[PDB]
Amino acid sequence: GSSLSRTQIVNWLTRCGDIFSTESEYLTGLDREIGDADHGLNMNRGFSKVVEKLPAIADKDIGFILKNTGMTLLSSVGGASGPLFGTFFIRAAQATQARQSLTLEELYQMFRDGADGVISRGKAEPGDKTMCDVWVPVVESLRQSSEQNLSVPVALEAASSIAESAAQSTITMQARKGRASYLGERSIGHQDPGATSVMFMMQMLALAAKE
Amino acid sequence: GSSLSRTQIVNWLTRCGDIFSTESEYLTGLDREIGDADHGLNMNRGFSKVVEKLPAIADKDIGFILKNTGMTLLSSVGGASGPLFGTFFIRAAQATQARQSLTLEELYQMFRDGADGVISRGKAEPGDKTMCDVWVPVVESLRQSSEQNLSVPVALEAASSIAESAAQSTITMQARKGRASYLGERSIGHQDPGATSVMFMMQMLALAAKE
Amino acid sequence: SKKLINDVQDVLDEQLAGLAKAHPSLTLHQDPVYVTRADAPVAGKVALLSGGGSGHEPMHCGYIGQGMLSGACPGEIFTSPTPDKIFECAMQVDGGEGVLLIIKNYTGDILNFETATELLHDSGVKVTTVVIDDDVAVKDSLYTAGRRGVANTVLIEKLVGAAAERGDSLDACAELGRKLNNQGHSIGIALGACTVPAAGKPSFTLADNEMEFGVGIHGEPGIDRRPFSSLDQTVDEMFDTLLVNGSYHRTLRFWDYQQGSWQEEQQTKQPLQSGDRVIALVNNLGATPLSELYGVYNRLTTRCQQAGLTIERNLIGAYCTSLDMTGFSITLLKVDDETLALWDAPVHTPALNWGK
Amino acid sequence: SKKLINDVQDVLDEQLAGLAKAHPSLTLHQDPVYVTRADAPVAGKVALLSGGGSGHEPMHCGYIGQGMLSGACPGEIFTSPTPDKIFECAMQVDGGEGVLLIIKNYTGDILNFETATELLHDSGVKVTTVVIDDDVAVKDSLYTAGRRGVANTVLIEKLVGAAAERGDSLDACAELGRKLNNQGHSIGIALGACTVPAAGKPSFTLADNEMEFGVGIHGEPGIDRRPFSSLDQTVDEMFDTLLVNGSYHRTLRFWDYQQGSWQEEQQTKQPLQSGDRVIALVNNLGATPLSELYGVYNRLTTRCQQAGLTIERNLIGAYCTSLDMTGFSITLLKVDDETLALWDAPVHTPALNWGK
Numbered sequence A, B: 001g002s003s004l005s006r007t008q009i010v011n012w013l014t015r016c017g018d019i020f021s022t023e024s025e026y027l028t029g030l031d032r033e034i035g036d037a038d039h040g041l042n043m044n045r046g047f048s049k050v051v052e053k054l055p056a057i058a059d060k061d062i063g064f065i066l067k068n069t070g071m072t073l074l075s076s077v078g079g080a081s082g083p084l085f086g087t088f089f090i091r092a093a094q095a096t097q098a099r100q101s102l103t104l105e106e107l108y109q110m111f112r113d114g115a116d117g118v119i120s121r122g123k124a125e126p127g128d129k130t131m132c133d134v135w136v137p138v139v140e141s142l143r144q145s146s147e148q149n150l151s152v153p154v155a156l157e158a159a160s161s162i163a164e165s166a167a168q169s170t171i172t173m174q175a176r177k178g179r180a181s182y183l184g185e186r187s188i189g190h191q192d193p194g195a196t197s198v199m200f201m202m203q204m205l206a207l208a209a210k211e
Numbered sequence C, D: 001s002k003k004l005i006n007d008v009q010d011v012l013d014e015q016l017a018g019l020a021k022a023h024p025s026l027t028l029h030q031d032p033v034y035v036t037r038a039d040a041p042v043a044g045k046v047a048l049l050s051g052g053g054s055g056h057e058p059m060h061c062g063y064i065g066q067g068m069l070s071g072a073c074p075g076e077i078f079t080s081p082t083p084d085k086i087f088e089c090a091m092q093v094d095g096g097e098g099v100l101l102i103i104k105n106y107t108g109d110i111l112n113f114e115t116a117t118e119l120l121h122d123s124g125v126k127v128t129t130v131v132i133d134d135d136v137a138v139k140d141s142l143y144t145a146g147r148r149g150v151a152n153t154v155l156i157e158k159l160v161g162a163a164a165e166r167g168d169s170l171d172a173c174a175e176l177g178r179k180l181n182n183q184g185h186s187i188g189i190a191l192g193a194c195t196v197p198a199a200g201k202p203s204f205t206l207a208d209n210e211m212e213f214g215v216g217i218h219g220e221p222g223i224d225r226r227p228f229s230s231l232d233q234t235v236d237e238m239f240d241t242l243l244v245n246g247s248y249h250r251t252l253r254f255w256d257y258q259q260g261s262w263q264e265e266q267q268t269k270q271p272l273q274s275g276d277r278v279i280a281l282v283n284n285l286g287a288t289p290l291s292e293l294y295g296v297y298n299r300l301t302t303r304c305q306q307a308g309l310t311i312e313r314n315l316i317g318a319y320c321t322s323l324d325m326t327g328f329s330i331t332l333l334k335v336d337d338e339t340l341a342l343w344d345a346p347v348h349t350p351a352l353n354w355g356k
Ligand SMILES: Nc1ncnc2c1ncn2[C@@H]1O[C@H](COP(=O)(O)OP(=O)(O)O)[C@@H](O)[C@H]1O
Pocket: A031, A035, A036, A038, A039, A042, A078, A079, A080, A081, A082, A084, A118, A121, A122, A123, A124, A129, A130, A131, A132, A177, A178, A179, A192, A193, A194, A195, C078, C079, C080, C106, C107, C108, C109
């Protein structure tokens, strides 16, 4: 049956290291227009540290790897995204726990629990112009894919492609949370940096699950 | 016999007010290249105050008017040119004293004594790149004109025209005194602001003496 | 570009080392980075801690000393520090009487300082919190993250630092900070953007007749871009906004160490009014000449007199910055005789020093 | 353009008014302009006076107070003040024990302060002078106006201000100032020029990889325009120049109040040497971030250690500026225990404040 292995999750996180390095300046520029120009650096610094610690733990259980990842990000990313992405991974790990692979259904639950964590820490609602504008649609994609008994790889391919449109959907919102909310209507016309990071993370998961 | 009247001296100083106002920015730019960009403002502020006090004293003796002028400049121009031009007028006034008009010969002595004052206060030698590079040639012009028994108006016309070439001659000197001497060889290629001020003053005297 | 730095990765390492070298009274800790009074822990006193991104020097490390902070956590440039750094630093400075965390209101500072407060509680450390949200530019908290904590953080760290030193309890410290937070008012403008070391371009560009009005401290654009005309004009718009945006309602959470949980507290601010007495802080955002700040003060005193406000103390200088930003902020904090007594009390920090 | 000013003609009027308003301890006099301690004349002490153009704030008015200056004469921007202002100010502050004039070495300051010294003598006032020429950039006094007085003026005003306050005589004050002048060494660089209020263009332009090396305080170009590469590089060139240009011979004139005449004094400076102890001042020229000054200090301490010099005290901040200039200067003043004792003595000024 269709599942996502522990080494695919390792591979995912490893690809995040690559993407956050490559798109560092792009994310920075997004956070320059409607922020303080640091997001890219924060994500790069965080996943860079994650990906360094990863080879020493590549053989532990999925819950272990995700929880350490969240804790690593927390100790390193800083700013608003550090506690938010840290919480995502920590809550995702307690959905998972000692798994060695994950069914679509468990992936959905994992992402559902992660996002619920970012929503209660940050209180963002749809249209606030945050990473939650990508998480929520992503979770609902996973839910739908699960109903339809899709394979894990095409489920993530569809979640990823939904993440893309959701990130883009932010351009148009006036920010109501985060630093961008201080700019008022000046935040309209600009893509949310954190939502872009979620998009990149989902794009790398689709890649990780292809085989 | 050919003489320079007290009201022509008043007229001279009045024309200096005009020239230092008109050429304020030009003198400023000269003192920007090789200085601190203040000369024009200093001369404008000084002669502006002189020319305000002048109508109340237009009927006193030449020595009186010149000495007050020097004292007014001193209390107002500041920086290096304040004490230097103040001393010029104060020493010129004690050559003059209670005159009501001045012969070529007394003009020469007046300018000779003025300049001697600026030279001993400042110690500038020919080629140091200062106002003294115009004063000294100007005094020697007046001397020569006196030998030749020229009229006062053409004497000043020739002193003025010598002042012009002397000011221009500074472009080429490396400064050895004043603020410009801190720039070393970077002071070469630039006209001395203070020498330009002397030139303007001599040009206005020629004008004042025409009638 | 054009910063006095070496490699971008090493800027904070080099700058913090220089801080520790210059200051015998300060200890630079490593792995994790943070800074403390060399004589912390000080037994018998409430310990005062704060922190935030690098780039606002002297805030906060310039305020570590007797009468002020016991330690501070510098983060990365314009980046809130992480909970482990705040946790270790608070552990290091704990004087048996509790630890007070002063937190500027940014999503990141709030969340990281909150995670840290809970870790401390769970370690048996008595702890509570004060949130600073003095920046009146963001008028309305309804559909925003809330007002920013800017320069008033300094006035509050001093006053609360004085009470902590006087021997006041955690609770009396916290309540003092929260009261002051409720009647302190700030606003900033920028004439030119800062450039972060990793950037080579400024955070925003601006024509010679334009200003960013209602700026904070991390280089984001302000609440609007408007014409710049004169000192008097600029100071008048700022002051008039201190008054019209003075009314503010919002919810701030503080740690109840007895419950062991976050306590929402809905609180409202009044605009400053005729008859109030204030401390005025005229604060360089980084690259404004001191002379111009005095020109700003000249105008501010006039507007204060006209509005019925009496300035009892002032600070004029570079106290809470944004790297190399050309601009300034005005802060007016309402006071009484008891608060003035804490103002005048000794303080011995790199940035602030008097008495004793 | 883009300055926080109103009409150009009124900038100093507005800024000085703001100074007097902010500072209860300072009296602003009019017609002629100058500034004094509100409690001058102080009977029984040598009175310390200085002055110079506006544009170097806080120097000199930020240094008026107990332990430092008794008064100061601000001139126009970058313009030496006139002899009448210095004369009236010295008359105002005369404490029966003499007046000491501290004069930075510029043609204008020298000539105006000299004219003033003579007026004072002729009024029966006991008076003498100290000339400051710490700037090592202009290597050689032979065919120049002489080395400029820059940031070391602050360290000397403090130390001599301490002796004056301790109760030392005019002569012991003067001799102390002149000795310190002989072993204090400064150098400055600019990354960006200042703009004076009347100007709308900066005093010089510069590419991103260029610096003005060996700059003073009035915005003139330095002794050369050279590549800018890094903090370490910049600080290394500056420091190496402090040492190689340390040797200096020149003539400084001081008033002999007994003779009633100028006394030439040919004096020579030694370069700083292995085993000397110093006070280090890392001085913002106006628009450098405090954080970068700490980065500069980090490097400076290394170079000092390597050269055998022990930094005993430091100041890091904006003490002697050039309006909105992006740059900094380094000053190293050689000291002994007796000079350190004067450093640590109380000082109560707007810019400097400790003890007592
Ligand atoms: N209250 C919130 N809830 C969810 N996400 C948020 C919230 N506030 C900010 N964010 C996310 O954080 C991103 C900015 O992160 P970053 O630049 O790293 O932190 P900071 O704003 O402190 O500099 C935003 O683009 C947004 O997606």
